[PDB]
PDB file of C-alpha atoms in Angstrom:
ATOM      1  CA  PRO A   1       2.441  -5.470 -28.338  1.00 47.05           C
ATOM      2  CA  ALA A   2       1.246  -7.616 -25.522  1.00 51.23           C
ATOM      3  CA  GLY A   3       2.371  -6.698 -21.584  1.00 54.48           C
ATOM      4  CA  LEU A   4       5.187  -3.716 -21.461  1.00 51.49           C
ATOM      5  CA  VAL A   5       6.050  -1.857 -24.439  1.00 56.50           C
ATOM      6  CA  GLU A   6       8.565   0.869 -24.351  1.00 56.12           C
ATOM      7  CA  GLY A   7       7.562   3.939 -25.853  1.00 56.02           C
ATOM      8  CA  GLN A   8       3.920   2.944 -25.872  1.00 55.59           C
ATOM      9  CA  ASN A   9       2.409   2.348 -22.245  1.00 53.91           C
ATOM     10  CA  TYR A  10       5.869   3.004 -20.163  1.00 58.43           C
ATOM     11  CA  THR A  11       9.341   4.917 -20.815  1.00 56.76           C
ATOM     12  CA  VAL A  12      12.382   5.149 -18.689  1.00 58.77           C
ATOM     13  CA  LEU A  13      14.043   8.367 -16.831  1.00 57.41           C
ATOM     14  CA  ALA A  14      17.067   9.676 -17.933  1.00 56.90           C
ATOM     15  CA  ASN A  15      17.972   9.901 -14.205  1.00 55.69           C
ATOM     16  CA  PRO A  16      16.269   7.821 -11.779  1.00 57.25           C
ATOM     17  CA  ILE A  17      14.928   8.846  -8.584  1.00 54.36           C
ATOM     18  CA  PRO A  18      16.334   7.767  -5.369  1.00 53.30           C
ATOM     19  CA  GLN A  19      13.548   5.271  -3.776  1.00 53.25           C
ATOM     20  CA  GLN A  20      12.775   6.609   0.034  1.00 54.87           C
ATOM     21  CA  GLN A  21      12.903   2.773   0.810  1.00 55.26           C
ATOM     22  CA  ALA A  22      16.177   0.297  -0.162  1.00 58.78           C
ATOM     23  CA  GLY A  23      14.586  -3.606  -1.328  1.00 60.01           C
ATOM     24  CA  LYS A  24      11.057  -2.540  -1.358  1.00 58.65           C
ATOM     25  CA  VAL A  25       9.372  -1.333  -4.821  1.00 56.41           C
ATOM     26  CA  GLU A  26       8.155   2.419  -5.231  1.00 59.37           C
ATOM     27  CA  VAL A  27       5.529   3.745  -6.526  1.00 58.72           C
ATOM     28  CA  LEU A  28       5.939   7.168  -7.165  1.00 60.16           C
ATOM     29  CA  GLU A  29       3.019  10.425  -7.870  1.00 61.70           C
ATOM     30  CA  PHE A  30       3.835  13.608  -8.352  1.00 63.40           C
ATOM     31  CA  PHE A  31       0.568  15.443  -8.536  1.00 60.04           C
ATOM     32  CA  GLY A  32      -0.902  18.612  -7.523  1.00 58.91           C
ATOM     33  CA  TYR A  33      -3.998  19.418  -5.515  1.00 58.58           C
ATOM     34  CA  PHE A  34      -5.345  22.371  -8.027  1.00 60.25           C
ATOM     35  CA  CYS A  35      -4.993  19.453 -10.804  1.00 61.11           C
ATOM     36  CA  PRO A  36      -8.489  18.068 -11.969  1.00 62.77           C
ATOM     37  CA  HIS A  37      -6.915  15.046 -13.174  1.00 59.86           C
ATOM     38  CA  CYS A  38      -4.883  14.822 -10.257  1.00 60.10           C
ATOM     39  CA  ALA A  39      -8.395  14.567  -8.265  1.00 60.81           C
ATOM     40  CA  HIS A  40      -9.838  11.982 -10.766  1.00 61.81           C
ATOM     41  CA  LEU A  41      -6.681   9.611 -10.537  1.00 60.82           C
ATOM     42  CA  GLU A  42      -6.375   9.802  -6.708  1.00 59.59           C
ATOM     43  CA  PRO A  43      -9.846   7.397  -6.119  1.00 59.20           C
ATOM     44  CA  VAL A  44      -8.238   5.011  -8.775  1.00 57.89           C
ATOM     45  CA  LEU A  45      -5.046   5.178  -7.337  1.00 56.38           C
ATOM     46  CA  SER A  46      -5.333   5.059  -3.735  1.00 56.73           C
ATOM     47  CA  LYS A  47      -7.964   2.028  -3.906  1.00 57.97           C
ATOM     48  CA  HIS A  48      -5.305   0.294  -6.226  1.00 59.86           C
ATOM     49  CA  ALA A  49      -2.380   0.693  -3.415  1.00 60.92           C
ATOM     50  CA  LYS A  50      -4.770  -0.875  -0.892  1.00 60.95           C
ATOM     51  CA  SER A  51      -3.764  -4.279  -3.433  1.00 65.10           C
ATOM     52  CA  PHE A  52      -0.351  -3.524  -3.021  1.00 66.01           C
ATOM     53  CA  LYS A  53       1.785  -6.557  -1.832  1.00 65.47           C
ATOM     54  CA  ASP A  54       3.611  -6.083   1.800  1.00 64.33           C
ATOM     55  CA  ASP A  55       7.086  -4.653  -0.944  1.00 64.43           C
ATOM     56  CA  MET A  56       5.525  -2.391  -2.273  1.00 65.67           C
ATOM     57  CA  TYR A  57       4.478   1.266  -1.184  1.00 66.49           C
ATOM     58  CA  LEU A  58       2.907   4.643  -2.238  1.00 66.70           C
ATOM     59  CA  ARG A  59       5.250   7.570  -2.078  1.00 65.88           C
ATOM     60  CA  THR A  60       3.378  11.170  -3.623  1.00 69.23           C
ATOM     61  CA  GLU A  61       5.165  14.665  -3.806  1.00 67.34           C
ATOM     62  CA  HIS A  62       3.316  17.606  -4.566  1.00 65.20           C
ATOM     63  CA  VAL A  63       4.599  19.751  -7.514  1.00 65.48           C
ATOM     64  CA  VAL A  64       6.433  22.929  -6.700  1.00 66.96           C
ATOM     65  CA  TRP A  65       6.316  25.252  -9.955  1.00 67.68           C
ATOM     66  CA  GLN A  66       6.043  28.721  -8.084  1.00 69.85           C
ATOM     67  CA  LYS A  67       6.685  30.435  -4.867  1.00 65.92           C
ATOM     68  CA  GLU A  68       3.385  30.921  -4.162  1.00 65.35           C
ATOM     69  CA  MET A  69       2.611  27.074  -4.629  1.00 66.60           C
ATOM     70  CA  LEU A  70       5.028  26.059  -1.794  1.00 66.67           C
ATOM     71  CA  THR A  71       2.616  26.020   0.628  1.00 69.35           C
ATOM     72  CA  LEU A  72       0.633  23.592  -1.134  1.00 67.14           C
ATOM     73  CA  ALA A  73       3.505  20.960  -0.874  1.00 62.16           C
ATOM     74  CA  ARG A  74       3.607  22.202   2.989  1.00 60.54           C
ATOM     75  CA  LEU A  75       0.040  21.050   3.076  1.00 62.52           C
ATOM     76  CA  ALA A  76       1.021  17.565   1.205  1.00 62.51           C
ATOM     77  CA  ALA A  77       4.236  17.123   3.519  1.00 64.45           C
ATOM     78  CA  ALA A  78       1.460  17.823   6.859  1.00 61.39           C
ATOM     79  CA  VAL A  79      -1.252  15.224   5.646  1.00 62.17           C
ATOM     80  CA  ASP A  80       1.408  12.605   4.861  1.00 60.75           C
ATOM     81  CA  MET A  81       3.217  13.220   8.517  1.00 59.60           C
ATOM     82  CA  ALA A  82       0.154  14.094  10.533  1.00 59.08           C
ATOM     83  CA  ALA A  83      -2.719  11.723   8.330  1.00 59.74           C
ATOM     84  CA  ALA A  84      -0.783   8.797   7.570  1.00 61.23           C
ATOM     85  CA  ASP A  85      -3.240   6.246   8.753  1.00 56.89           C
ATOM     86  CA  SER A  86      -6.109   8.206   6.913  1.00 59.78           C
ATOM     87  CA  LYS A  87      -4.653  10.145   4.353  1.00 59.43           C
ATOM     88  CA  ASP A  88      -7.209   9.179   1.603  1.00 57.57           C
ATOM     89  CA  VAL A  89      -9.943  11.108   3.242  1.00 57.91           C
ATOM     90  CA  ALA A  90      -7.394  13.803   3.638  1.00 56.94           C
ATOM     91  CA  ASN A  91      -6.578  14.153   0.210  1.00 54.25           C
ATOM     92  CA  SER A  92     -10.207  13.416  -0.667  1.00 52.64           C
ATOM     93  CA  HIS A  93     -11.118  16.531   1.185  1.00 53.63           C
ATOM     94  CA  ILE A  94      -8.707  18.607   0.164  1.00 51.43           C
ATOM     95  CA  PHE A  95      -9.518  17.784  -3.503  1.00 50.22           C
ATOM     96  CA  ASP A  96     -12.802  18.933  -3.262  1.00 49.52           C
ATOM     97  CA  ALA A  97     -11.835  22.159  -1.586  1.00 51.36           C
ATOM     98  CA  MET A  98      -9.361  22.790  -3.895  1.00 49.13           C
ATOM     99  CA  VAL A  99     -10.619  21.496  -7.178  1.00 45.65           C
ATOM    100  CA  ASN A 100     -14.545  21.873  -6.582  1.00 45.72           C
ATOM    101  CA  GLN A 101     -15.199  24.509  -3.421  1.00 44.23           C
ATOM    102  CA  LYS A 102     -12.315  26.698  -5.143  1.00 44.25           C
ATOM    103  CA  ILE A 103     -10.600  27.233  -1.886  1.00 43.11           C
ATOM    104  CA  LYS A 104      -7.300  29.388  -1.603  1.00 45.40           C
ATOM    105  CA  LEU A 105      -5.554  26.560   0.057  1.00 46.57           C
ATOM    106  CA  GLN A 106      -2.325  28.347  -1.096  1.00 49.52           C
ATOM    107  CA  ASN A 107      -3.006  31.029   1.047  1.00 48.82           C
ATOM    108  CA  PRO A 108      -1.787  30.441   5.063  1.00 49.98           C
ATOM    109  CA  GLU A 109      -4.549  32.222   6.562  1.00 48.14           C
ATOM    110  CA  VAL A 110      -7.140  30.596   4.575  1.00 47.70           C
ATOM    111  CA  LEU A 111      -5.306  26.634   4.984  1.00 48.40           C
ATOM    112  CA  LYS A 112      -4.484  27.373   8.753  1.00 49.61           C
ATOM    113  CA  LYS A 113      -8.203  28.102   9.446  1.00 51.05           C
ATOM    114  CA  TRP A 114      -9.840  25.019   6.740  1.00 52.94           C
ATOM    115  CA  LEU A 115      -7.685  22.564   8.432  1.00 52.22           C
ATOM    116  CA  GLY A 116      -8.479  23.451  12.234  1.00 50.55           C
ATOM    117  CA  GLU A 117     -12.392  22.662  11.090  1.00 49.52           C
ATOM    118  CA  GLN A 118     -11.862  19.718   9.369  1.00 50.55           C
ATOM    119  CA  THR A 119     -12.154  16.270  11.622  1.00 52.26           C
ATOM    120  CA  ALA A 120     -13.494  13.440   8.562  1.00 53.60           C
ATOM    121  CA  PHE A 121      -9.815  13.435   9.008  1.00 51.93           C
ATOM    122  CA  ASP A 122      -7.998  14.723  12.051  1.00 52.02           C
ATOM    123  CA  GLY A 123      -7.353  18.386  10.839  1.00 50.46           C
ATOM    124  CA  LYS A 124      -5.863  19.741  14.096  1.00 51.11           C
ATOM    125  CA  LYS A 125      -3.363  17.026  13.913  1.00 54.07           C
ATOM    126  CA  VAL A 126      -2.705  18.120  10.385  1.00 53.09           C
ATOM    127  CA  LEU A 127      -2.581  21.873  11.133  1.00 52.61           C
ATOM    128  CA  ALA A 128       0.049  20.872  14.241  1.00 50.25           C
ATOM    129  CA  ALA A 129       2.172  18.967  11.214  1.00 46.69           C
ATOM    130  CA  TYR A 130       1.943  22.309   8.747  1.00 48.38           C
ATOM    131  CA  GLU A 131       3.397  23.984  11.590  1.00 47.48           C
ATOM    132  CA  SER A 132       6.281  21.819  12.503  1.00 50.58           C
ATOM    133  CA  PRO A 133      10.162  22.343  11.042  1.00 52.54           C
ATOM    134  CA  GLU A 134       9.524  18.974   9.428  1.00 51.49           C
ATOM    135  CA  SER A 135       6.787  19.774   6.711  1.00 48.16           C
ATOM    136  CA  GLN A 136       8.658  23.126   5.901  1.00 49.00           C
ATOM    137  CA  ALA A 137      11.918  20.147   4.929  1.00 48.98           C
ATOM    138  CA  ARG A 138       9.420  17.823   3.286  1.00 51.71           C
ATOM    139  CA  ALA A 139       8.101  20.841   1.288  1.00 51.77           C
ATOM    140  CA  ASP A 140      11.189  21.955   0.039  1.00 51.48           C
ATOM    141  CA  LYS A 141      12.356  18.312  -0.722  1.00 50.71           C
ATOM    142  CA  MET A 142       9.353  18.247  -2.847  1.00 50.70           C
ATOM    143  CA  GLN A 143      10.642  21.685  -4.752  1.00 49.95           C
ATOM    144  CA  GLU A 144      13.991  20.125  -5.077  1.00 49.03           C
ATOM    145  CA  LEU A 145      12.854  17.310  -6.773  1.00 50.51           C
ATOM    146  CA  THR A 146      10.156  18.920  -9.593  1.00 51.67           C
ATOM    147  CA  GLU A 147      13.708  21.089 -10.504  1.00 44.68           C
ATOM    148  CA  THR A 148      15.966  18.908 -10.403  1.00 45.61           C
ATOM    149  CA  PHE A 149      14.017  15.573 -12.043  1.00 47.98           C
ATOM    150  CA  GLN A 150      12.132  17.940 -14.693  1.00 46.60           C
ATOM    151  CA  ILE A 151       8.776  17.277 -13.641  1.00 47.98           C
ATOM    152  CA  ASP A 152       6.782  19.644 -15.656  1.00 44.40           C
ATOM    153  CA  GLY A 153       3.605  17.618 -16.003  1.00 46.75           C
ATOM    154  CA  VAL A 154       0.633  15.958 -13.117  1.00 45.69           C
ATOM    155  CA  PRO A 155      -0.060  13.573 -12.826  1.00 44.73           C
ATOM    156  CA  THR A 156       2.916  11.678 -13.497  1.00 44.89           C
ATOM    157  CA  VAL A 157       3.509   8.224 -11.664  1.00 45.54           C
ATOM    158  CA  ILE A 158       7.086   6.280 -11.837  1.00 44.05           C
ATOM    159  CA  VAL A 159       7.769   2.957 -10.364  1.00 43.76           C
ATOM    160  CA  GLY A 160      11.081   1.554  -9.053  1.00 43.80           C
ATOM    161  CA  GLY A 161      12.698   5.200  -9.138  1.00 42.16           C
ATOM    162  CA  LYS A 162      12.967   4.456 -13.261  1.00 42.65           C
ATOM    163  CA  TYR A 163       9.962   3.874 -15.048  1.00 42.18           C
ATOM    164  CA  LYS A 164       7.084   6.498 -15.669  1.00 40.32           C
ATOM    165  CA  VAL A 165       3.822   5.001 -16.650  1.00 41.01           C
ATOM    166  CA  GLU A 166       2.104   6.449 -19.988  1.00 40.97           C
ATOM    167  CA  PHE A 167      -1.552   6.699 -19.123  1.00 41.03           C
ATOM    168  CA  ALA A 168      -3.979   5.780 -21.731  1.00 44.78           C
ATOM    169  CA  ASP A 169      -6.471   6.122 -18.561  1.00 43.28           C
ATOM    170  CA  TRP A 170      -6.307   5.425 -14.661  1.00 43.61           C
ATOM    171  CA  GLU A 171      -7.625   2.040 -14.459  1.00 39.78           C
ATOM    172  CA  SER A 172      -5.504   0.467 -17.583  1.00 33.05           C
ATOM    173  CA  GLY A 173      -2.640   2.064 -16.058  1.00 32.28           C
ATOM    174  CA  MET A 174      -3.106   0.348 -12.513  1.00 37.20           C
ATOM    175  CA  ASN A 175      -2.084  -2.841 -14.726  1.00 35.75           C
ATOM    176  CA  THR A 176       0.975  -1.133 -15.868  1.00 37.42           C
ATOM    177  CA  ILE A 177       1.709  -0.094 -12.459  1.00 38.16           C
ATOM    178  CA  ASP A 178       1.631  -3.936 -11.385  1.00 36.91           C
ATOM    179  CA  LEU A 179       3.770  -5.140 -14.664  1.00 40.68           C
ATOM    180  CA  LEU A 180       6.167  -2.453 -13.449  1.00 41.46           C
ATOM    181  CA  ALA A 181       6.228  -3.671 -10.037  1.00 41.38           C
ATOM    182  CA  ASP A 182       7.129  -7.161 -11.299  1.00 38.88           C
ATOM    183  CA  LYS A 183       9.886  -6.042 -13.398  1.00 38.74           C
ATOM    184  CA  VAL A 184      11.387  -3.863 -10.500  1.00 37.60           C
ATOM    185  CA  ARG A 185      10.699  -6.714  -8.196  1.00 39.77           C
ATOM    186  CA  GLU A 186      12.913  -9.186 -10.091  1.00 39.02           C
ATOM    187  CA  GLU A 187      15.420  -6.261 -11.524  1.00 39.41           C
ATOM    188  CA  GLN A 188      16.704  -5.455  -8.447  1.00 38.73           C
ATOM    189  CA  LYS A 189      16.732  -9.877  -7.043  1.00 37.84           C
ATOM    190  CA  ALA A 190      18.599  -9.991 -10.008  1.00 39.27           C
ATOM    191  CA  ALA A 191      20.940  -7.646  -9.351  1.00 39.57           C
ATOM    192  CA  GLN A 192      21.245  -8.246  -5.491  1.00 40.78           C
TER     193      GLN A 192
END
């Protein structure tokens, strides 16, 4: 009952998600900017990621559950691109705008004006990223992942491509991530 218990604090995916970086331990969060629980997880997870070892990284993917949602995935892509060095501020700003302010960032006309006005993070650079072909292809991939892996709830966190965190609350889930990361690290080394 202590530590990792399959079916209790984690489960194993039927089909693993390929990691972006080989030989590292990926922590993958599926989320949506419209999602209140995702906005609450955000500060916990982003803080915890500061503790990550050099062989771990946090990857995020926005779900696409309807055609209108692709714009939000393109925003997520743009933040990843242009705001890599201050993603936390950007996500903070976007969750507030969507969840608290009720701004329709899923509408490109609304989103582009809003982005141009942000400076707590580099809104103009994120706007440029949004307008780039990279972001359209990052967003298409998010839809593909959503459908292929049947991600039907957010937030969802998967470690090492295969271990889904079953959260009791956000804080305890961070401990689960650490345990799963060690499990992965030593699985991947034992197989090499």
